[PDB]
Amino acid sequence: RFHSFSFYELKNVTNNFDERPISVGGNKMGEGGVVYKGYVNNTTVAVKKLAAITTEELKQQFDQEIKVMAKCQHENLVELLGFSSDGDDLCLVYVYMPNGSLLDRLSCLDGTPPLSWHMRCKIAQGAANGINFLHENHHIHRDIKSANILLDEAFTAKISDFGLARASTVMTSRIVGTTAYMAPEALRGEITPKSDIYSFGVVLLEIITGLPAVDEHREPQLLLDIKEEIEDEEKTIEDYIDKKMNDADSTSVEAMYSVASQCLHEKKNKRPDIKKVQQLLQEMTA
Ligand SMILES: CC(C)Nc1cc(Nc2ncncc2F)ncc1C(=O)NC[C@@H](F)C(C)(C)O
C-alpha cells in the first residue's frame, strides 16, 4: 500500500536534501531525523530522513512506523505515502502539513499568528479523536507530544511519529520517549495506554498556557512543575492562561484544565480512558 522510493528519487524530490530553512526558500522544515519539503509530481510532501540508539533499533522504529501506518488510516492521523529503505539510509514520505506542528504554532514560530481559543479547542478534540482511533485499534503511541501533533491547511490535528508504537501493563528494558511529557510509570519502563492519556494531559496544559512542556530558559523549566504550583494553591490556572489569545473564556478554559488535571492523576487507574477524554472535551464546547 506504500510506494517504495529509491533514496535517489527522494534526492530529486527534496532538491538533494537542501538544508536551508523553508522560511527562506529551502527544503528543511524541522529537526531533532530531519524533515524536508519536496514535490512528488504536483503533491507537496514531507520527507523524514532518519538519523542515528543502535542501527537495528532505528530500523525497528522505521519498520514499526510502516506497520502502524499500514493498519491505521484516520482523518486525525498523518498519512504515509511511501518510504525508502535501500542502503544505510531510511526515509519516510508523508503528505505535507501546511501548518506544521502544534508545538511550533503555539510558539508562533516563523511569525505565524497565535491560535485562537476556538481553534485550540478544535485541535484538542481532533488530537483526542486520533488517539481514540489508535487505542480502539490496540495501539499505544508512547510519544504523545505537541511536536507530534501536526496541522493541515484547515488546522485539522493529525497525530504523527509511530516509530515507538506498541500493540496492546507490560515492561521494557529500553526506556524511550520525551521526558517532559512522560507519565511516571513510562519513565520507569511500564508500557500502558494510560501513559498516552497522561502525555495528552501535558499537551492540554501547553494548549491552555502556550508554554512548551520543557524550556531550558524558563523558571520552572518543566510545565509539570507549574501544574504542581497550581495543585499546591501557590497559583491558579488563570495566572497561566496564554496572553496571546483574545477569545478565551474562563468557563471553557477551566473545563479544559479540569480534563488536563484528570489526565495527570498521580495513579494511572484514576486517569480517564481516551473515550472519556473525548466526551469531556465535547462537553467543553457544547
Ligand atoms: C517537521 C515539522 C515541524 N514540520 C512539518 C511536518 C510535515 N509533515 C510531517 N513531518 C513528519 N512526520 C509526518 C508528517 F506528516 N509537514 C510540514 C511541516 C512544516 O514545517 N510545514 C510548514 C508550516 F510549518 C509553515 C509554513 C507555517 O512553516
Swiss-Prot record:
**What does UniProt say on post-translational modification here?**
Phosphorylated.
The protein's gene is named: IRAK4
Keywords on this record?
Acetylation, ATP-binding, Cytoplasm, Disease variant, Immunity, Innate immunity, Kinase, Magnesium, Nucleotide-binding, Phosphoprotein, Serine/threonine-protein kinase, Transferase
Reaction catalysed by this enzyme: L-seryl-[protein] + ATP = O-phospho-L-seryl-[protein] + ADP + H(+); L-threonyl-[protein] + ATP = O-phospho-L-threonyl-[protein] + ADP + H(+)
Give the enzyme's EC designation: 2.7.11.1
Q: Where does ATP bind?
A: 29-35, 48, 145-148, 161
- Needed co-factor(s): Mg(2+)
Recorded coiled-coil stretches: none
Modified positions (Phosphothreonine) in chain numbering: 169, 172
Where does the protein end up?
Answer: Cytoplasm
- In what residue span(s) does the Protein kinase domain sit? 23-281
Q: What is this protein called?
A: Interleukin-1 receptor-associated kinase 4
